[PDB]
Symmetry: C15
Subunit: 82 residues, 15 copies
């Protein structure tokens, strides 16, 4: 067991990296997906192209939150200090 | 049984990870699902394609919050410090 | 029976988990449901398709706040520390 | 009878759980219901279908705040610590 | 006459439960009632339908704040601690 | 005369219950009333129906702020602690 | 003649009750009155009906702020504690 | 002549009462006045009806900030405590 | 000459009264005036009627900030305490 | 050279009066001038009218910030306390 | 050299007067200028009138920030206290 | 194992770099991808062009957050101080 | 070589003056330049007039931030106190 | 190796520089790129011209965040103080 | 080598200067660039005029953040105090 300023800061930090880090990407994925299904309603023949482009986009955005995830995980499972 | 700065920080961190972590994805899911059912009303024949793309989208967004859940669960059931 | 920093933090944390965890999902659910009933007004024949997709959607959003609920419940009934 | 940091925290937490927990669902219920009554005016024949889907939606949103309520209730009537 | 941390926290908690707990429902009620009244102007013949769906909706929203009011009332007239 | 943490917290609490508690309902009543008079301009023959529905709505919203009022008044005229 | 925590809190509480208490209702009154004069321009024959409904609305909104006034006046002229 | 916590709080309170008390009403007055002059451009013949209703409105909004002014004035010229 | 907590508070209060007190009225005056000059362009024959109604409006909004000014002036030139 | 709580509060107060006091009027002036210039483009013949009403409006708004400037200048060159 | 509460407050105050004081006027100048060039695109023959009116407007808005500037400069080059 | 002010500041810093650093890019990516997918629906033939411009854009935005990630990674695996 | 409250305040003040001071003018410049290039697309013949007016506007806005720069530079290179 | 107030500050500063520094540019890059791909769909023949102008824009915005990056880098690799 | 309040403040200040200094300009650049590429889609023949005006614009906005950069650089490489 260990408790000090740095272990305390690490668990808070871990929460903030993934917590805050999902805000922009979460909204952004919704905006993109929303336009995707709207576009499919408009032009069902473009479904494949639309899906392909969305998927790509979803990946970029999800990688943003994943950066927060790796920081969180480094802090919890590979902490350099504590 | 155990109380210090780091246990106190862990329980707060746990709540913040899942609480904050649900904000962007919750809004994003509503936006996407909203455009999806609008699109279905507009072009009921496209419902399978729209549902497929939405479902894909919903999963990517839910995953953002699940990262938060994971951090919360590690802090609660596999805490590295306390 | 027991009071320290960690019991105090735990009860605050439990409330922030569910309380904050309902903001994005509640707003999202409203956005999606509203587009659903609007969609039904526009095309009452698509009512079954619209309803099925809405329901799917509402479940994904409900799960986001449930993650908060779960963290709140372990904190209250299976606290790892106090 | 008893006052310490946890009883004080428990009462504030209970309030935060239900108070904050009503913000998203309250806005969302209004957005849905306004769209529902707009739909009815637009297509009074779909009223039953609209009302049915709205009811389903409202219950989902109400459940979100109910999660807050139960945390508040546990804190006040089944408090694990104090 | 007793004053301690918990009695002070309790009166504050009481105000926060009902004060904050009215923001979402109050806004939501406005939105819904506004759409309803506009709907009546558009289609006076659907007034009974519109008015019924509104009433149902208002009640769901008022319940959200009432949960706050229950917490306030427990904290004031059935306080578990003080 | 009496001054302690709890009398101080009570007068602040009283102010916050009615102060904050008027924000949502005040905006909401404006939104609803605004659509009402707009609807009357559009369809002056629906004036009675519109007024009836508004009035009902205004009552629900005003009851939300009134909950804050009763808490304030319990705190000032029927305080359980001080 | 008299200064302590509770007198200081009372004077602040008084200002906050009326100051905050005017925000939602002030905005709401502007919104409603604005739609009212727009409606009059649109249908000058409906001016009596529009004025009647507005006046009713203005009263309900003013009452929200008056609750704030009342709390302020009790704190200043009928203080229960100091 | 006299300085303590309560004189200090009283002057701050007086300023917050009028200062904050002008935000909602000032914005509201602008919204209503702007719709009024727009209305007059659309239907100059309704100018008298529009003006009368505006004036009524402006008075209700002005009264909201006046409540703030009144609390400020008693605090300055009829302080109950200091 | 004199410095204590109340002189310090008085100067800050005076600034807050006029500074905060200009925000709503400043925005509102702009909203009204922009609508006024838009109306004039639309119907230059109504200019006198528009200008007249605008003037009335502007004075009402200016009075709101003037209430702040007078509190500031009392605090600086007729201070009851210091 | 004197430094005390009040001299420090005074220089800060001075900045807040004119700094905060420019937000509403600055935004408002922009809104009004933008509408004016757009109006001129729409109806170049009404330029004299539009320009006169604008000038009048600008002066009312600049006065709001000037009140802030008066407070600043008193606090700096005619300080009542220090 | 001199360092005390008041020199420290003066340099911060100076920054806040011009820093905050550019926010409203900066936005407002953009809004106005934007409508000006839009109006010129619409009616290039009105270019002279539009420019004349913009210029006037820009001056009023720029004077608002200049008030913050003179306070800053009084504080740095003509400080009444330090 | 070392804990000091700097190790604590470093883990927090790491979370802030990637957490905050994802807000703008995440929102921006959503906006861009949404427009792209809508564009494809409008003109399926331009899909290759649209998709290429999007990909280029996504990369510029992901780099913004990656800068945050670099700072986080230095702070964690190549800390200059601790 | 020199450290005290006022040197620390000066360096912070310097950053805040230019940092905050760029917010309104940066947004305003984007708004104006945006309408300018839209206007050019709309009426390419007006490009000289639009460019002239924009350039004038850009200068006035840049000047707002430069006031911030000036305060920062005085604090850094001509500090009156330290 | 070394921990003091400046090393702690340096690491937080580095994070704030790149984290905050990505917010505006990230939003702006998204706004530009979305408009770019919308333009391409509208006029696929202009793609090269659109892509060229977008590239120029993206580099300008990226440079803004790069300024943050370099401050962060100096703080971490060329720190003048620690 | 050296740590005190002023080195600490200086590094924080340097980061706030560039970090905050990029928000308005980054958003502004996005607004202008987006209107530019939209303009090019509408009128590809005006591409050169549009690009030239955009470029001019981007430079004015870039300079705003550069002022921040400059304050950051003197603070780091030509600190007047430490
Ligand atoms: O000054 C050095 C000493 O500091 C420690 O105690 C200090 C230390 O600042 C910290 O535990 C405590 O402050 C803790 C408040 C910070 C809470 C949280 C931390 C990270 C996430 C954000 C905020 O205060 C103690 C007393 O002032 C420990 O007593 C000891 O290990 C160490 O040597
Ligand atoms: O490192 C854990 C230590 O916790 C205590 O000291 C702690 C103490 O908990 C706390 O009141 C104090 O800071 C109290 C502030 C708590 C702020 C909050 C708590 C978690 C959520 C975010 C931050 O710091 C002390 C450092 O000396 C006790 O001395 C002991 O239980 C244990 O040694
Ligand atoms: O730090 C854990 C310790 O908790 C207790 O001490 C605590 C004490 O309860 C508390 O007043 C003190 O901090 C008091 C402020 C706590 C505010 C907190 C913030 C997060 C949300 C809940 C409210 O810190 C002490 C640290 O020694 C007990 O002394 C002991 O059982 C235990 O070791
Ligand atoms: O006055 C008698 C009572 O005093 C104690 O409470 C103390 C407590 O220890 C202390 O931290 C507290 O100072 C803490 C001030 C906390 C302010 C808080 C902020 C929002 C929620 C409510 C108000 O003062 C209390 C005064 O009542 C005990 O709680 C109690 O055992 C005892 O009966
Ligand atoms: O610790 C218990 C004792 O606490 C009291 O003094 C304490 C007590 O926290 C409070 O008066 C004071 O803090 C008062 C700050 C809270 C202001 C306000 C209160 C409600 C509304 C929101 C915030 O500090 C005293 C000294 O730290 C009293 O001295 C005594 O009656 C009591 O026994
Ligand atoms: O309970 C009232 C008591 O007030 C004083 O103690 C008070 C004192 O006023 C105050 O500086 C301290 O807290 C000071 C913080 C004031 C915060 C603010 C004030 C009202 C507006 C909201 C909250 O707490 C002390 C508790 O010991 C004096 O000891 C005495 O006048 C009186 O016994
Ligand atoms: O609590 C009331 C008492 O007020 C004075 O003491 C005061 C003292 O002025 C003040 O520095 C201290 O608090 C100092 C901080 C006050 C900040 C306040 C917050 C609200 C807005 C105005 C500024 O508390 C003391 C409490 O003992 C006098 O000692 C006495 O006349 C009186 O009994
Ligand atoms: O330096 C000499 C002077 O010192 C005293 O002021 C003291 C005061 O008591 C103390 O609370 C104060 O610390 C309080 C710090 C308050 C910061 C405040 C926040 C915003 C508004 C302005 C700045 O330090 C002052 C230093 O001047 C007295 O006010 C005065 O009688 C005396 O002439
Ligand atoms: O109480 C009076 C004495 O106050 C001074 O020290 C006090 C004084 O409040 C101030 O320097 C320091 O607080 C400084 C914090 C305020 C930072 C900043 C100031 C203006 C801009 C906004 C906030 O604390 C010292 C110790 O508490 C000096 O020691 C002395 O010159 C003076 O006589
Ligand atoms: O525990 C051992 C170390 O303790 C010291 O750090 C002390 C430091 O002096 C003290 O101000 C500090 O209390 C300050 C609490 C600051 C909270 C801060 C807020 C956001 C960024 C991170 C967390 O406690 C530290 C505990 O590590 C020294 O930094 C270091 O020399 C030493 O090795
Ligand atoms: O007046 C300058 C004095 O600075 C120190 O005292 C200062 C000390 O710097 C500081 O920690 C304390 O306040 C520390 C708070 C710093 C807040 C922040 C700093 C600048 C940016 C805005 C405000 O006040 C002390 C007053 O006694 C030292 O005693 C000495 O270097 C010098 O006499
Ligand atoms: O005030 C300047 C003095 O700085 C040092 O003392 C400093 C000390 O570093 C610091 O912990 C203390 O304040 C500690 C809190 C500083 C927070 C600060 C806020 C702005 C952004 C950066 C972080 O104040 C002391 C004042 O005596 C040294 O003692 C000395 O070299 C120098 O005279
Ligand atoms: O790094 C990138 N972001 C992620 C997008 C989804 C796949 C994983 C990488 N892409 C580019 C950003 C610019 C530099 C790296 C390449
Ligand atoms: O990792 C990703 N996010 C999850 C979304 C839900 C399905 C599981 C993966 N997507 C991509 C982003 C990073 C690059 C490749 C993976
Ligand atoms: O359980 C859920 N929420 C309840 C709200 C009240 C109506 C019934 C559902 N939703 C989903 C979360 C778990 C996955 C499926 C269910
Ligand atoms: O886990 C998910 N969310 C729940 C929503 C309600 C249905 C049950 C699953 N979906 C996917 C997100 C990540 C990929 C796998 C699971
Ligand atoms: O319980 C609910 N909320 C109240 C609204 C007003 C009428 C009474 C019920 N809704 C549902 C929550 C989930 C399923 C049960 C009912
Ligand atoms: O409680 C309600 N709110 C108020 C509306 C206006 C009249 C007074 C009651 N209504 C319903 C909410 C759900 C449960 C109670 C009934
Ligand atoms: O109490 C109400 N509010 C006031 C509005 C202005 C006229 C006086 C009453 N209305 C209703 C809400 C609570 C249920 C019945 C009363
Ligand atoms: O007195 C009011 N405000 C004044 C502003 C300057 C022009 C004259 C009116 N309005 C109302 C508040 C009290 C009720 C009627 C008057
Ligand atoms: O009190 C009210 N507000 C004032 C506005 C200006 C005219 C005078 C009254 N109106 C009503 C609100 C509550 C019901 C009775 C009074
Ligand atoms: O005094 C007012 N404001 C100033 C605006 C610029 C011209 C000078 C007057 N307006 C009115 C406040 C209420 C009635 C008096 C005048
Ligand atoms: O003071 C004013 N503001 C500035 C506008 C640009 C030229 C310099 C003055 N104008 C009027 C405001 C009302 C009182 C003074 C005249
Ligand atoms: O001083 C002004 N602002 C600057 C804008 C950029 C060119 C230089 C002047 N304009 C006017 C406002 C104050 C009254 C006259 C001057
Ligand atoms: O360096 C830049 N940003 C990265 C975006 C992703 C591709 C790699 C470069 N842009 C420009 C900044 C200013 C000029 C240099 C390039
Ligand atoms: O230098 C500037 N920013 C650079 C961003 C990357 C592309 C090249 C320009 N803009 C202006 C600021 C100084 C005035 C002209 C240049
Ligand atoms: O200083 C200015 N801003 C820079 C933007 C990029 C081109 C170089 C100048 N423009 C004017 C603002 C104040 C009037 C003179 C200078």
């Amino acid at each position: 067991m260990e408790s000090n300023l740095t272990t305390a800061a690490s668990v808070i930090a871990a929460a903030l990296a993934v917590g805050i880090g999902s805000i922009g990407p979460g909204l952004g994925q919704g905006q993109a997906a929303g336009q995707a299904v709207e576009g499919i309603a408009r032009q069902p023949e473009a479904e494949g192209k639309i899906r392909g482009t969305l998927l790509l986009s979803l990946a970029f955005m999800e990688a943003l939150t994943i950066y927060g995830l790796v920081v969180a995980l480094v802090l919890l499972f590979a902490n350099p200090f504590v």
